[PDB]
């Protein structure tokens, strides 16, 4: 029921917690690497080395579950109290696009790291659990390997009007 997060990702998550909460810095919402893009890249890379058709099928359906759950989950348990203003602004700006096409790996990894406590309430079969968790492990490894391209480099300071708007 536990995961193996690399120490670089732990450090990055704590640094992002601090930057967003205490230092009043946000992330540019339209990302150059998309969530869908990274999902597709990892999917292609793993299928290109997978072995049998049963594994192909389970991996495909796992990735599908991942993307649909992201799109259904982002705006409910993935943002801090300092980002809801930005979230509603982005929804007003692009009301036709979707979150899987809007946000990035900076939040995909929040989803990944938080998955254990969610599978804590969920109680499906241990086989499915272990498949999904191994897939999440390999995904975290792939991200921390390709750090240079997927992750943002500098955060952005929120403007005074934004801060007066949020105020929380």
């Amino acid at each position: 029921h536990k995961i193996s997060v690399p120490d670089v990702l732990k450090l990055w998550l704590v640094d992002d917690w601090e930057n967003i909460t205490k230092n009043q810095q946000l992330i540019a919402i339209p990302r150059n690497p998309t969530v869908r893009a990274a999902i597709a890249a990892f999917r292609e890379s793993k299928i290109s080395h997978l072995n049998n058709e049963i594994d192909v099928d389970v991996f495909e359906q796992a990735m599908a579950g991942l993307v649909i759950y992201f799109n259904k989950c982002l705006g409910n348990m993935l943002l801090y109290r300092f980002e809801r203003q930005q979230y509603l602004e982005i929804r007003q700006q692009y009301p036709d696009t979707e979150m899987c096409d809007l946000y990035g790996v900076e939040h995909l990894i929040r989803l990944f790291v938080s998955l254990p406590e969610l599978i804590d309430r969920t109680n499906m079969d241990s086989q499915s659990i272990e498949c999904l968790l191994n897939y999440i492990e390999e995904f975290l490894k792939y991200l921390v390997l390709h750090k240079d391209e997927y992750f943002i480099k500098e955060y952005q300071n929120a403007p005074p009007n934004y801060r007066s708007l949020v105020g929380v």
Binding site: V14, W17, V58, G65, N76, L79, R110, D125, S128
Partner: protein, 239 residues
Amino acid sequence: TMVDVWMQLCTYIDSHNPIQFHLPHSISSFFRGVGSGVMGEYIETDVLKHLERDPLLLKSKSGTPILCFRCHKSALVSQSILACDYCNSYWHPDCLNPPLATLPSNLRKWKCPNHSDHVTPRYRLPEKAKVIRVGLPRGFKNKGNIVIDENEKPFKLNFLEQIRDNVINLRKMVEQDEQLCIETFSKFDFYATRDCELPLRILCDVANDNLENDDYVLALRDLLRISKWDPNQPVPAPF
């Protein structure tokens, strides 16, 4: 299968009431110094572990005297003194290099300028960190900051002979110094008090000395010339 896992996840999320994010307790209690807050915020856990600031401190709880570190005075030549919450030092709020206008808040620990953590790049240690003793005697790349404490006759003289000798020696040095200086009077006067009218000479009758030419460089840098000819010695006009 994992399709059913996805179904159960969707059912849970659309059944429950949204909340704000908090990374797991493992990641949170990983590092040293970090800690949650009242509304899920990030607050460093280095505050005053004891709990308006007492402006003048004279006596310490250990009897050690309270003298400023830089000027060695006693919190009475200036109406306030500050106590470092990391070492056994006291500083005047006026002796620090940028002098502090107001004393800091009695909530947050204050750190004197005699610590190395002011110019280290911040880092984070995990809260299971065995202090390693590096044996490499020389040439150890150490990221500048993570080196912890560098761990490794009774005479009964009873005489004032040396004290008397030292006092007389001090008086003799003083006597010689005073003699030399008070002979070089009557020339200190001429070369330091008429020094304001010889510059007037080498300005009026424009004789090029190093300082005149430096002043002209100063005036050119004020006027911000580019490529035209320098006008003359007395006609650059920030008059």
